[PDB]
Amino acid sequence: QQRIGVIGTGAIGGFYGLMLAHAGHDVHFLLRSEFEAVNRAGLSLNSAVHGFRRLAPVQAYHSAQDMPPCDWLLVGAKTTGNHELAPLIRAAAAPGAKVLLLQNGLGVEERLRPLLPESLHLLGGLCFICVHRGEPGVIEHQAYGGVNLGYHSGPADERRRREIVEEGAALFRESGLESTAMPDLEQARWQKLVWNIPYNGLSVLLKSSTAPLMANADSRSLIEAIMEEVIGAAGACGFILPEGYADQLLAATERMPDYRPSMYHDFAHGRPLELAAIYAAPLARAAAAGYRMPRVEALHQALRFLEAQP
Amino acid sequence: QQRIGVIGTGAIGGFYGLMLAHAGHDVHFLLRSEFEAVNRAGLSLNSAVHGFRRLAPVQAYHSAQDMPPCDWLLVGAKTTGNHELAPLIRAAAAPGAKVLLLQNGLGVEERLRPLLPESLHLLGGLCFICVHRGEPGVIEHQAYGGVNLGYHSGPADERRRREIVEEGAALFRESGLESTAMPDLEQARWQKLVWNIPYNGLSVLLKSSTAPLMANADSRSLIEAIMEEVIGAAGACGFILPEGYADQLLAATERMPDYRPSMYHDFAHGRPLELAAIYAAPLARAAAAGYRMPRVEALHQALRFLEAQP
Numbered sequence: 216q217q218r219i220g221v222i223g224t225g226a227i228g229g230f231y232g233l234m235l236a237h238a239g240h241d242v243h244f245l246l247r248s249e250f251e252a253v254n255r256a257g258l259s260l261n262s263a264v265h266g267f268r269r270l271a272p273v274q275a276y277h278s279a280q281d282m283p284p285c286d287w288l289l290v291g292a293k294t295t296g297n298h299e300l301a302p303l304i305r306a307a308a309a310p311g312a313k314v315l316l317l318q319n320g321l322g323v324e325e326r327l328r329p330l331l332p333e334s335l336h337l338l339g340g341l342c343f344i345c346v347h348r349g350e351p352g353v354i355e356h357q358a359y360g361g362v363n364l365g366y367h368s369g370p371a372d373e374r375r376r377r378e379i380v381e382e383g384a385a386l387f388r389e390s391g392l393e394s395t396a397m398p399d400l401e402q403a404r405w406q407k408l409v410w411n412i413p414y415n416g417l418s419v420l421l422k423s424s425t426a427p428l429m430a431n432a433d434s435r436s437l438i439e440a441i442m443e444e445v446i447g448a449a450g451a452c453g454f455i456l457p458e459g460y461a462d463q464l465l466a467a468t469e470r471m472p473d474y475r476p477s478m479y480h481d482f483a484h485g486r487p488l489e490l491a492a493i494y495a496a497p498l499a500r501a502a503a504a505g506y507r508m509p510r511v512e513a514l515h516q517a518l519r520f521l522e523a524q525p
Numbered sequence: 526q527q528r529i530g531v532i533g534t535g536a537i538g539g540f541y542g543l544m545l546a547h548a549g550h551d552v553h554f555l556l557r558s559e560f561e562a563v564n565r566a567g568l569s570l571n572s573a574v575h576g577f578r579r580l581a582p583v584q585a586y587h588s589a590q591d592m593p594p595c596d597w598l599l600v601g602a603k604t605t606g607n608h609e610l611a612p613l614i615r616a617a618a619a620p621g622a623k624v625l626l627l628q629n630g631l632g633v634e635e636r637l638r639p640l641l642p643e644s645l646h647l648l649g650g651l652c653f654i655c656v657h658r659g660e661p662g663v664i665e666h667q668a669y670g671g672v673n674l675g676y677h678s679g680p681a682d683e684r685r686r687r688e689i690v691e692e693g694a695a696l697f698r699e700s701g702l703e704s705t706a707m708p709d710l711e712q713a714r715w716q717k718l719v720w721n722i723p724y725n726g727l728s729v730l731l732k733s734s735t736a737p738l739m740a741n742a743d744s745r746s747l748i749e750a751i752m753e754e755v756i757g758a759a760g761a762c763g764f765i766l767p768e769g770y771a772d773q774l775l776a777a778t779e780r781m782p783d784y785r786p787s788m789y790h791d792f793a794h795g796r797p798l799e800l801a802a803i804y805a806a807p808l809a810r811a812a813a814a815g816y817r818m819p820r821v822e823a824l825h826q827a828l829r830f831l832e833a834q835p
């Protein structure tokens with residue numbers, strides 16, 4: 216039994232902490248705005264995959280300093296707050312703890328590493344899941360749920376790194392989730408950008424969920440074009456992605472239920488968009504490699520304009 | 526004294542017909558939805574350039590067949606209706622009349638020519654003007670007003686074509702407007718696309734007038750990038766545009782008052798956008814020349830998506 220801490224208990228943190236808790240793990244949740252309702256009424260899950268689940272009472276905390284030392288810390292905050300998140304991770308971390316970022320974007324682990332003791336293992340958890348927060352304390356899970364883990368940095372040698380990635384994957388596997396050990400976390404993060412770059416921004420820019428974006432031929436063509444820019448940028452930075460990856464990803468999105476990306480909810484609620492990790496970072500990597508992404512560049516500009524307007 | 530007919534009496538047709546009428550010309554206005562208010566109360570102009578002007582009574586018509594034969598026909602409809610407009614132009618045209626399209630876009634004259642008798646002179650009038658309709662019968666003119674004329678097709682040889690272009694320019698010059706005879710109408714239309722392609726679409730896509738688009742650094746950079754695509758496409762199709770044209774156009778737009786492009790009003794009022802002439806036509810010309818315009822292509826796709834959404 217690992218002791219798990221969830222740092223940022225939103226849609227992602229709530230889902231994975233609840234799943235792990237349901238599987239017999241000792242899970243401790245750090246909450247912010249919704250601490251009162253969850254501490255009181257608990258956490259509940261509507262899921263088309265796993266059915267209804269409820270955790271009550273919850274081991275809930277409003278301050279990381281109150282949390283006991285945890286062996287695995289699942290970071291479910293958005294990447295926008297990661298700098299301010301580091302002191303909270305450090306406080307809840309047992310010695311040699313594993314820090315696992317359940318976060319989208321590129322360069323996420325690298326930008327956090329200077330704020331974590333080198334004695335902590337820092338891993339990335341790429342989650343392929345359609346989930347959002349409903350009413351407070353209620354998690355709305357529409358599809359998928361798998362987590363692909365990769366190792367960024369920490370005191371482990373290569374052999375130990377693979378063992379630790381497998382330990383994390385086993386945690387999620389024991390809970391009834393799909394989990395995969397990745398050999399190359401950066402490659403995996405580039406792969407995931409092919410979906411998140413078009414769908415997250417375009418859902419805000421065109422105020423639309425996934426199904427209308429796929430059903431209209433102009434947005435569908437635009438999504439495919441953006442995917443090829445991300446695929447081309449990844450290759451230019453030394454990360455070749457599979458043949459016909461765009462067609463595959465587009466097909467999976469057709470099969471997907473009508474879904475509002477996380478960025479859609481952020482703009483709806485006036486929360487800052489994860490532009491830095493999802494757009495700014497791969498655009499910077501692309502320019503360093505001499506590869507231009509005109510549609511992605513323009514999307515990022517449009518989203519920045521939208522965030523500045525009254 | 527030329528007899529002038531205005532076919533489509535909106536912001537552009539109202540302005541130029543009124544200006545010409547104020548200068549002593551015999552002007553006859555074809556109106557549609559606003560015929561009742563203008564036939565009754567007349568046409569009035571608030572202008573920061575020319576001050577207030579009013580034409581009352583107006584020679585107003587709801588049917589082109591009622592109009593007398595006109596020597597010059599000023600077409601102020603949007604380009605979306607040009608196919609349906611041709612029988613109206615033919616009816617109001619005196620023998621050998623001059624048809625002058627006060628319309629944005631590319632290939633406008635070419636697409637109309639098959640529907641006009643070869644005995645009519647078909648010219649393009651590129652209007653550089655900030656104008657929109659206010660209340661019915663009221664024209665809101667914020668800045669500029671100049672018209673650059675070019676000859677597309679008709680029974681005139683080169684010498685005669687230049688003479689006729691100069692005759693048109695003189696009409697507007699006599700009315701107190703800036704007017705220029707252009708040697709190459711297609712070149713002039715490509716030039717004008719450099720402004721209309723970014724500003725018309727982006728004002729709809731980002732729901733913004735010109736001043737916020739210029740004041741935000743991300744949209745300003747995006748506008749400049751789009752301009753270079755249009756400039757590059759024009760060159761690829763054999764129409765070299767001047768050095769530093771983008772910087773000049775951007776500077777003029779800074780000097781410009783806060784302006785909502787015509788396309789902004791169209792989307793606000795549920796009217797179809799002039800996508801075919803402003804985006805589809807130059808994109809097709811570019812692809813024929815082997816030159817891709819990724820930002821313009823994506824903007825057109827986004828605007829088409831927006832027009833299809835409920």
Ligand SMILES: NC(=O)C1=CN([C@@H]2O[C@H](COP(=O)(O)OP(=O)(O)OC[C@H]3O[C@@H](n4cnc5c(N)ncnc54)[C@H](OP(=O)(O)O)[C@@H]3O)[C@@H](O)[C@H]2O)C=CC1
Nearest residue numbers: 223224225226227246247248291292293317318319344477
């Ligand atoms: N298929 C995919 O690609 C998916 C990936 N994601 C990604 O996962 C990450 C999180 O997404 P998501 O769960 O949907 O976002 P949410 O807003 O739903 O949850 C984020 C949680 O982190 C909390 N948080 C931030 N800072 C703190 C802090 N100091 N202390 C306590 N709590 C904090 C927030 O609290 P508070 O509510 O008070 O603000 C919030 O509850 C993102 O990077 C997202 O892109 C998300 C969904 C699907």
Ligand SMILES: NC(=O)C1=CN([C@@H]2O[C@H](COP(=O)(O)OP(=O)(O)OC[C@H]3O[C@@H](n4cnc5c(N)ncnc54)[C@H](OP(=O)(O)O)[C@@H]3O)[C@@H](O)[C@H]2O)C=CC1
Nearest residue numbers: 533534535536537556557558601602603627628629654787
């Ligand atoms: N600086 C620039 O680039 C500028 C250029 N333009 C361009 O000029 C052209 C017209 O623009 P604008 O005046 O602003 O648009 P408006 O909508 O204001 O006016 C168009 C007029 O044409 C009328 N119309 C269309 N079909 C008919 C018909 N069968 N019979 C009678 N009337 C008809 C419309 O009548 P109804 O009202 O009933 O629909 C309308 O009054 C466009 O191509 C536009 O892009 C416009 C402004 C600035």
